[PDB]
C-alpha cells in the first residue's frame, strides 16, 4: 500500500508524508544520499517481508519505482 | 502500561527523596568514616595457609623470636664511619625496644656483639641495622600500631650529631601504604567530581541538570560507603585500602552512569513529544530493568573476588558487592524520584536537539555489511595480545608508593650503603629429632651452608659456621652467644640467613627459592640429618606463593564472573545467544585492554604493572563492559517489531549518544584514580579506564550491533520474532 511506503520515506528523510510525491527522486528531489537510500531499501524490505538485491536497490531511485516493486512482488 | 513499582515511586517521590536523605545523615554520624573503619578493620596480607607464611611463624616460635610474620628493620646512618658513640646510641635504642613487650616481641641484636657486628656493619662503615619481630601480622591494625610505637621510640631517642635513624621492612611499608591510600582519598574524589562536572556540563549545557545528577550520585556514594562502613564497624567483614579506594570510585562511576541513563532516556521521550508523566513511565520501562540488570552485574561480578585466595582479592568481594548493591538501590529508587520532582519544576527537559543522524548512519553501515565490519573490529580487539609475550609482572611495592613515605626513606638509606638484598633476607631453618651441638652434625650443617652459597643469585650465607657470612670451636663462649641466634636454644633445629645478589622481588629472585629447597634437600640426603624437615621463609619465599597464587586465582575470579554475568544477562533478556553476545564480545575485548594498559605502563612509562592490576581490573572491565551491551541489546528488544535490521538502526540512534557519554564518564571516573599516591590503584584505574574506553567505542558501537544483524532471528532464541 502506498500509504505505509510514503510514511516510511517521510520518516527516514525527515519530510512530511504529504510532501513526498510518487515521481519524486530520493536523492535528487528529497535530498537523500547513499546511506539514506540503503536505509530506505532495508526498511521497505523488513516492513513488507521482502528482499532486494543490490542490482535493484540502485535501480529503485524514485518513490514510484519502489511502489511498483513492492506491489508486484506482494 | 504503567508498571506498579514505577507508579508507587511516582506517587511517593518526595518521601523517597526524604528517606534516602535521612539514611545519609544517620550514617556518617553514627558510624566512623569508611577510611577510619578500614584502619581499625584491616586484614592480614599473607594467606593463612601459604607455606611461606606458616614457615615464618614456625621459625619464630621455635627461636622464641615472636610468632607473627611481621618483621621490621631499624637502620642507622651517619655522615662518618659509625664510631663507638653510635654503639652507645644503638644500645639505648635497643634497650627501649626490648622493653615494649606489647609491640616489639623480640629484637635480634647483632651489631652489639663484636663477634658478629662486622657482619652487619656497612662495608663503608657508615651504616648498620637491626631487625625486630613486631606483634601482629603484616597490615593488621595491631601491626600498624606496633610500627608506629617502634617509629615513635626511634624518633624519641635523641640521635648523636650527624646520625640518622629510619624504620623499614615489609611491615612498615604495608602500614605506610594504608595511610597513603587513606590520605589520598580526598584528592581522588575531588578531582573525580571536578572532572565529571566539566564533562557533564558540556554534555547537557545545563548547570542545574548536572547539579541534581551529582547530588543523586553523592547520596548514591554516601549510602554505598555508609553501609559498608556499618558492616566493617560491626566486624562482619575485613577491609583494605584497595577496597575503600576501589569502592569509592565505582560508586561515583556506576552512580553517575545510572543517572545518565535515567536522564538520557527520559530526555529522549520529551524530544518525541511525550508528556511529563508519559515520558517518566517511558523512561522506567526502557531503563529500569537495565539499571537493575547492570546493578547486579557489578555487584555480582565483584563478589566473585570473594572466591579468590589472596587476602587482597578476597577482601574486595563483600565490601564492593554490598556497596554496589546499595548504590544501585539508590539509583533505582532515588533516580526516578528526583527525576519526577525535577520534572515537576521543569528542569530536566533537553536543552539541545538530541541528534541521531550520526549514529543511525553508523547503524546502516553495520547492519547492511555486518561481516566485513565484524572481522575488522574483531581483529583490532585481538591485536592487543601483542603485549602478552613481553608482559612482565612486578612485585616491588617500593616503586608503587611515593618516594617520601617513611618506609621508602629508610630503604633509600639502605641502598646508599648496602646491596639492595641486605634489607630483604631469607631465613632457612631445618628441624631434626635430636640435638645438633656436636661436631658431627656441625659438619653436615657446614656442608649445607656451602651448597646454598653457590646457588645462583645468592650473595651471603650466615651460619653458626659462618658468623660473618663468609668462610672462617663452637664451644667458645663468644661462639655460644652466636650459637644462641643460629641454633634452637635447646631444641632440635637450626637456621641460616640467606642474602641474594639482586632484588628477590624480581621473578628471577623468586626462581632461586626452588633451587634452595632442592640444593638443601640433596645436601641433606646421604647424611643422618636427611630426614630433617626444612622450613624456608623470607621476602622471596612469601612471593613464591604470591606468584603461584595470583596467577591461578585470576582464572577463578575471571571465569566465575563470566558464568555469573552470563546468568544475570540471561535472566534479564530471557534470550540465550543474546546473553552470550552481551558478555562474549567484552570477553574478546579484554585483549584490547590488556594490550593498551601494558603498552601505556610497561612500555611508554617504563613502569611494570603491579601483580594486583589484572585480577582487580578484569572483573570491572567484564562487568561494566557488559552493562553497556545490556543497555543497547535491551533497546533492540523494544525497538524490534518493525524489523530486526530496522530496530537495530533506530535503537543505536537513541542509545548511541547516551552510552558514549556514560562510557566516557565511567572511563574518566576510573582514570581519575591515577592521581592517588598509591600508584598501584592508579594502574587499576587506568587499566579499567582504557578498557572501558575501548569497549564503548568499538565493542558496543560495532561488534554487538554487527553480530546482532548477522545472527538474525536466532539472536533472540527461543523468543518469537515478528
Curated annotation (Swiss-Prot), chain A:
Residues 1-74 form the Carrier domain. Pfam families: PP-binding (PF00550). It comes from the Bacteria. One of its GO terms (biological process) is response to xenobiotic stimulus. It is found in: Cytoplasm. The modification O-(pantetheine 4'-phosphoryl)serine is found at residue 34. 4'-phosphopantetheine is transferred from CoA to a specific serine of apo-ACP by AcpS. This modification is essential for activity because fatty acids are bound in thioester linkage to the sulfhydryl of the prosthetic group. GO terms for molecular function: acyl binding; acyl carrier activity; lipid binding; phosphopantetheine binding. PANTHER family: ACYL CARRIER PROTEIN, CARRIER DOMAIN-CONTAINING PROTEIN. Carrier of the growing fatty acid chain in fatty acid biosynthesis. Belongs to the acyl carrier protein (ACP) family. This is Acyl carrier protein. It comes from Escherichia coli (strain K12).
Swiss-Prot record, chain B:
PANTHER family: MEMBRANE PROTEIN MJ1562-RELATED, MEMBRANE PROTEIN YDGH-RELATED. Belongs to the resistance-nodulation-cell division (RND) (TC 2.A.6) family. MmpL subfamily. Keywords: Cell inner membrane, Cell membrane, Membrane, Transmembrane, Transmembrane helix, Transport. This is Siderophore exporter MmpL4. GO terms for cellular component: plasma membrane. It is found in: Cell inner membrane. It comes from the Bacteria. The keyword Cell inner membrane applies. The chain crosses the membrane at residues 11-31, 195-215, 227-247, 288-308, 318-338, 369-389, 552-572, 576-596, 604-624, 658-678, 696-717. Interacts with MmpS4. Part of an export system, which is required for biosynthesis and secretion of siderophores. Its main location: membrane. It is a multi-pass membrane protein. InterPro entries: MMPL_dom, MmpL_fam, Mycobact_MmpL. The keyword NAD does not apply. SUPFAM superfamilies: Multidrug efflux transporter AcrB transmembrane domain. Gene3D superfamilies: Multidrug efflux transporter AcrB transmembrane domain.
Amino acid at each position: 500500500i502506498e500509504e505505509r511506503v510514503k510514511k516510511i520515506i517521510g520518516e527516514q528523510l525527515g519530510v512530511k508524508q504529504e510532501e513526498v510525491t510518487n515521481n519524486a527522486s530520493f536523492v535528487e528531489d528529497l535530498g537523500a544520499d547513499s546511506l539514506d537510500t540503503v536505509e530506505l531499501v532495508m526498511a521497505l524490505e523488513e516492513e513488507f517481508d521482502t528482499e532486494i538485491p543490490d542490482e535493484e536497490a540502485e535501480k529503485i531511485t524514485t518513490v514510484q519505482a519502489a511502489i511498483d516493486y513492492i506491489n508486484g512482488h506482494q | 502500561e504503567k508498571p506498579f513499582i514505577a507508579r508507587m515511586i511516582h506517587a511517593f517521590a518526595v518521601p523517597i527523596i526524604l528517606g534516602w536523605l535521612a539514611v545519609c545523615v544517620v550514617v556518617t554520624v553514627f558510624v566512623p568514616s569508611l577510611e577510619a573503619v578500614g584502619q581499625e578493620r584491616s586484614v592480614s596480607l599473607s594467606p593463612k595457609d601459604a607455606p611461606s607464611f606458616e614457615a615464618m611463624g614456625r621459625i619464630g616460635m621455635v627461636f622464641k623470636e615472636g610468632d607473627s610474620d611481621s618483621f621490621a628493620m631499624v637502620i642507622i646512618e651517619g655522615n662518618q664511619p659509625l664510631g663507638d658513640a653510635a654503639h652507645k646510641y644503638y644500645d639505648g635504642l635497643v634497650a627501649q625496644l626490648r622493653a615494649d613487650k606489647k609491640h616489639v616481641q623480640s629484637v635480634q641484636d647483632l651489631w652489639g656483639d663484636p663477634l658478629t657486628a662486622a657482619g652487619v656493619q656497612s662495608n663503608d662503615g657508615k651504616a648498620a641495622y637491626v631487625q625486630l619481630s613486631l606483634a601482629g601480622n603484616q597490615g593488621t591494625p595491631l601491626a600498624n600500631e606496633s610500627v608506629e610505637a617502634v617509629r615513635s621510640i626511634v624518633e624519641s631517642t635523641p640521635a648523636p650529631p650527624g646520625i640518622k635513624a629510619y624504620v623499614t621492612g615489609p611491615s612498615a611499608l604495608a602500614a605506610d601504604m594504608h595511610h597513603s591510600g587513606d590520605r589520598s582519598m580526598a584528592r581522588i574524589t575531588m578531582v573525580t567530581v571536578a572532572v565529571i562536572f566539566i564533562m557533564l556540563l558540556l554534555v547537557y549545557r545545563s548547570i542545574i541538570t548536572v547539579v541534581l545528577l551529582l547530588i543523586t550520585v553523592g547520596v548514591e556514594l554516601t549510602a554505598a560507603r555508609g553501609v559498608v562502613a556499618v558492616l566493617g564497624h560491626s566486624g562482619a567483614i575485613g577491609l583494605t585500602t584497595f577496597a575503600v579506594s576501589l569502592l569509592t570510585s565505582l560508586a561515583i562511576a556506576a552512580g553517575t552512569d545510572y543517572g545518565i541513563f535515567i536522564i538520557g532516556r527520559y530526555q529522549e521521550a520529551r524530544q518525541a513529544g511525550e508528556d511529563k508523566e508519559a515520558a517518566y513511565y517511558t523512561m522506567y520501562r526502557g531503563t529500569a530493568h537495565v539499571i537493575l540488570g547492570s546493578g547486579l552485574t557489578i555487584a555480582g561480578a565483584t563478589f566473585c573476588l570473594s572466591f579468590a585466595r589472596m587476602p587482597y582479592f578476597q577482601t574486595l568481594g563483600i565490601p564492593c558487592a554490598v556497596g554496589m548493591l546499595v548504590a544501585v538501590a539508590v539509583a533505582l529508587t532515588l533516580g526516578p524520584a528526583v527525576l519526577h520532582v525535577g520534572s515537576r519544576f521543569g528542569l530536566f527537559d533537553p536543552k539541545r536537539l538530541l541528534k541521531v543522524r550520526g549514529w543511525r548512519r553508523v547503524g546502516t553501515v553495520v547492519v547492511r555489511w555486518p561481516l566485513p565490519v565484524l572481522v575488522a573490529t574483531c581483529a583490532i580487539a585481538l591485536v592487543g595480545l601483542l603485549a602478552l609475550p613481553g608482559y612482565k609482572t612486578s612485585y616491588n611495592d617500593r616503586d608503587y608508593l611515593p618516594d617520601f613515605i617513611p618506609a621508602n626513606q629508610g630503604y633509600a638509606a639502605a641502598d646508599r650503603h648496602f646491596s639492595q638484598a641486605r634489607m630483604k633476607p631469607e631465613i632457612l631453618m631445618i628441624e631434626s629429632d635430636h640435638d645438633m651441638r656436636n661436631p658431627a652434625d656441625f659438619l653436615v650443617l657446614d656442608k649445607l651452608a656451602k651448597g646454598i652459597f653457590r646457588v645462583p643469585g645468592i650473595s651471603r650465607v650466615q651460619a653458626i659456621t659462618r658468623p660473618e657470612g663468609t668462610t672462617m670451636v663452637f664451644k667458645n663462649k663468644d661462639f655460644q652467644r652466636a650459637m644462641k641466634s643460629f641454633l634452637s636454644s635447646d631444641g632440635h633445629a637450626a637456621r641460616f640467613i640467606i642474602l641474594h645478589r639482586g632484588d628477590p622481588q624480581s621473578p628471577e629472585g623468586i626462581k632461586s627459592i626452588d633451587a634452595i629447597r632442592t640444593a638443601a634437600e640433596e645436601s641433606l640426603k646421604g647424611t643422618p640429618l636427611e630426614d630433617a624437615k626444612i622450613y624456608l621463609a623470607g621476602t622471596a619465599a612469601v612471593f613464591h606463593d604470591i606468584s603461584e597464587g595470583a596467577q591461578w586465582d585470576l582464572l577463578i575470579a575471571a571465569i566465575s564472573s563470566l558464568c555469573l554475568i552470563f546468568i544475570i544477562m540471561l535472566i534479564i533478556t530471557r534470550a540465550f545467544i543474546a546473553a552470550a553476545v552481551i558478555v562474549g564480545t567484552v570477553a574478546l575485548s579484554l585483549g584490547a585492554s590488556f594490550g593498551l594498559s601494558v603498552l601505556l605502563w610497561q612500555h611508554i612509562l617504563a613502569i611494570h604493572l603491579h601483580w594486583l592490576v589484572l585480577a582487580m581490573s578484569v572483573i570491572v572491565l567484564l562487568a561494566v563492559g557488559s552493562d553497556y551491551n545490556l543497555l543497547l541489546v535491551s533497546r533492540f528488544k523494544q525497538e524490534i517489531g518493525a524489523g530486526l535490521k530496522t530496530g537495530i538502526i533506530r535503537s543505536m540512534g537513541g542509545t548511541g549518544k547516551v552510552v558514549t557519554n556514560a562510557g566516557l564518564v565511567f572511563a574518566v571516573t576510573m582514570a581519575s584514580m591515577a592521581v592517588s599516591d598509591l600508584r598501584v590503584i592508579g594502574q587499576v584505574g587506568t587499566t579499567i579506564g582504557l578498557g572501558l574506553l575501548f569497549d564503548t567505542l568499538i565493542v558496543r558501537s560495532f561488534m554487538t550491533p554487527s553480530i546482532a544483524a548477522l545472527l538474525g532471528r536466532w539472536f533472540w532464541w527461543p523468543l518469537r520474532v515478528r
